[PDB]
C-alpha cells in the first residue's frame, strides 16, 4: 500500500513532536504523586482530527504523476523535514525543560508536606489519605487545577510548531503534483 509511506512521514517528522510532549506529561501523571492525586491528564489529549487526515484534505485529487514524483524526490523531502525538525526541537527544548523543572519544584514541596502525615497516620495512612482524592481537600484540588493548567499550557505552546511542521510537509507533497 502506497499510503503507508505517507502515514509514516507524518508519524516520524510531525507527530514525534507532540508525542515527545505527551511523554513529559505521562512521566508525572504515572509517578507516585500522580497515583496519589488520582490525576487524569491524558483523558482528552489526542487530536480530534489526526494529522494524516489533515494531509489528505489538503491533497484531495491524486494522480500517478504525484506517486512517480514521490519515489524520485522522497530523499529530498526526507532530508528537508529532518533538518527542520531538529531546529524546532532545540527551539522548544527550553520550554520542555521549563515545564519539567517547574513541575519538579512542586513535587518537592508536596512530598515534604505528605511524608510527615504518613508516619503520623501509621496503619491508617492507606484509607485516611483517600480524602486527598476528593473535593474537600484544599491541596488536592489545588494540585489537580495546577496539573490541568500546566498540561494545557504545554499543549498550546507546541501546537503552532506541529502545525508548521505539517504545513511544510503538505507544501512539499503539494509541489510534487504540479
Amino acid at each position, epitope marked *: 500500500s502506497p499510503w503507508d509511506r505517507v502515514k509514516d512521514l507524518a508519524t516520524v517528522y510531525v507527530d514525534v513532536l507532540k508525542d515527545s510532549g505527551r511523554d513529559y506529561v505521562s512521566q508525572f501523571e504515572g509517578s507516585a504523586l500522580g497515583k496519589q492525586l488520582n490525576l487524569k491528564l491524558l483523558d482528552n489529549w489526542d487530536s480530534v482530527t489526526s494529522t494524516f487526515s489533515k494531509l489528505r484534505e489538503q491533497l484531495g485529487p491524486v494522480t500517478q504523476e504525484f506517486w512517480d514524483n514521490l519515489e524520485k524526490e522522497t530523499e529530498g523531502l526526507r532530508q528537508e523535514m529532518s533538518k527542520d525538525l531538529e531546529e524546532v526541537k532545540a527551539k522548544v527544548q527550553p520550554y520542555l525543560d521549563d515545564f519539567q523543572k517547574k513541575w519538579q519544584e512542586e513535587m518537592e514541596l508536596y512530598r515534604q*508536606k*505528605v511524608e510527615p*502525615l504518613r508516619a*503520623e*497516620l*501509621q*496503619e*491508617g495512612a492507606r*484509607q*485516611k*489519605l483517600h*480524602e*486527598l482524592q*476528593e*473535593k*474537600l*481537600s*484544599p*491541596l*488536592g*484540588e*489545588e494540585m489537580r487545577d495546577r496539573a490541568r493548567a500546566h498540561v494545557d499550557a504545554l499543549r498550546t505552546h507546541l501546537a503552532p510548531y506541529s502545525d508548521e511542521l505539517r504545513q511544510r510537509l503538505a507544501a512539499r507533497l503539494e509541489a510534487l503534483k504540479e
Partner: antibody, heavy 123, light 107 residues
Framework: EVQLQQSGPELVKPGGSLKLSCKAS?XXXXXXXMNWVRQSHGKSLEWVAXXXXXXXXXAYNQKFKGKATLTVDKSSSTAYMELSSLTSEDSAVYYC??XXXXXXXXXXXXXXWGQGTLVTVSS | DIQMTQSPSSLSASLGETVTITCXXXXXXXXXXXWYQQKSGQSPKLLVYXXXXXXXGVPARFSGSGSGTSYSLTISSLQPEDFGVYYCXXXXXXXXFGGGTKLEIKR
C-alpha cells in the same frame, strides 16, 4: 501569627436569620479547610460543618444538614456561617477553627480557634 | 458517624493528684484523635493530637494513650492552669466531639 477574627455578639429575633463572619490572617485562606463548632452554655462542643475555602465544598453533619449553610469569600479571606429560622435553642457560642492539616486532608485536628461569636435569640 | 463518650462527666481532684480521662470510640479510629482544653469563658486550645503527640507549650505532665477503642488522657500532678473543661475529638470520619469533662479543684 495565624489568627481568626470573628464578628461581635449578635441578637436575632425568633424566626429570623443569622450570618457570622470569620476573618483569617497570617496564612493562606484557600490552603486549609475551615470548621465551625457550636457550644451552648455549659454544654459540649458540637461540630457543625466544614468548608473548603479554595473550592467552596461543604460538609454538613446530620444535626445541621439543612439548618446551617457555609459560604466563603475568597477576596476578603473570610468564612461565613448562616442559620435559617433561629429559635431559643439556637442561642449558643459559635467558633471557627482552621484544620491543622496543610490542605493534605479535610477532616483533621483543629489547630487555631477563633474567640467565638455569642448568639442569643429573643423577641 | 462515630460517637465519642467520656466516662467522667465531672471530676474533682486536689492539686498534684493523678487523674485519668477516658474517651471511648464507637468504632476503630486508627489513632487520629485530639484533646482540647477549655477554660471558663475561653476558646478551646489544642492539647494533644494523634492521641499521643502533645502540642506546643504543653507540659510533660499531660500524656495520652491508646488501648483499642478507649483513648485516655492522663495528668499526674495537677496545676491551677490544668483545671477546666476537656474534650476529645475523632478526626478519621466527619469530626465529632465527646460529652465533655469538667475538672474542678477539690478542697
Amino acid at each position: 501569627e495565624v489568627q481568626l477574627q470573628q464578628s461581635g455578639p449578635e441578637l436575632v429575633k425568633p424566626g429570623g436569620s443569622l450570618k457570622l463572619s470569620c476573618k483569617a490572617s497570617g496564612x493562606x485562606x484557600x490552603x486549609x479547610x475551615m470548621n465551625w463548632v457550636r457550644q451552648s452554655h455549659g454544654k459540649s462542643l458540637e461540630w457543625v460543618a466544614x468548608x473548603x475555602x479554595x473550592x467552596x465544598x461543604x460538609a454538613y453533619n446530620q444535626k445541621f444538614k439543612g439548618k446551617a449553610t457555609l459560604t466563603v469569600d475568597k477576596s476578603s479571606s473570610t468564612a461565613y456561617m448562616e442559620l435559617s429560622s433561629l429559635t431559643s435553642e439556637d442561642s449558643a457560642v459559635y467558633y471557627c477553627a482552621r484544620x491543622x492539616x496543610x490542605x493534605x486532608x479535610x477532616x483533621x485536628x483543629x489547630x487555631x480557634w477563633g474567640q467565638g461569636t455569642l448568639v442569643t435569640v429573643s423577641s | 458517624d462515630i460517637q465519642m463518650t467520656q466516662s467522667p462527666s465531672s471530676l474533682s481532684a486536689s492539686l498534684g493528684e493523678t487523674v485519668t480521662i477516658t474517651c471511648x470510640x464507637x468504632x476503630x479510629x486508627x489513632x487520629x484523635x485530639x484533646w482540647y482544653q477549655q477554660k471558663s469563658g475561653q476558646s478551646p486550645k489544642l492539647l494533644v493530637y494523634x492521641x499521643x503527640x502533645x502540642x506546643x507549650g504543653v507540659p510533660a505532665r499531660f500524656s495520652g494513650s491508646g488501648s483499642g477503642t478507649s483513648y485516655s488522657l492522663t495528668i499526674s500532678s495537677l496545676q491551677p492552669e490544668d483545671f477546666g473543661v476537656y474534650y476529645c475529638x475523632x478526626x478519621x470520619x466527619x469530626x465529632x466531639f465527646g460529652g465533655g469533662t469538667k475538672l474542678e479543684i477539690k478542697r
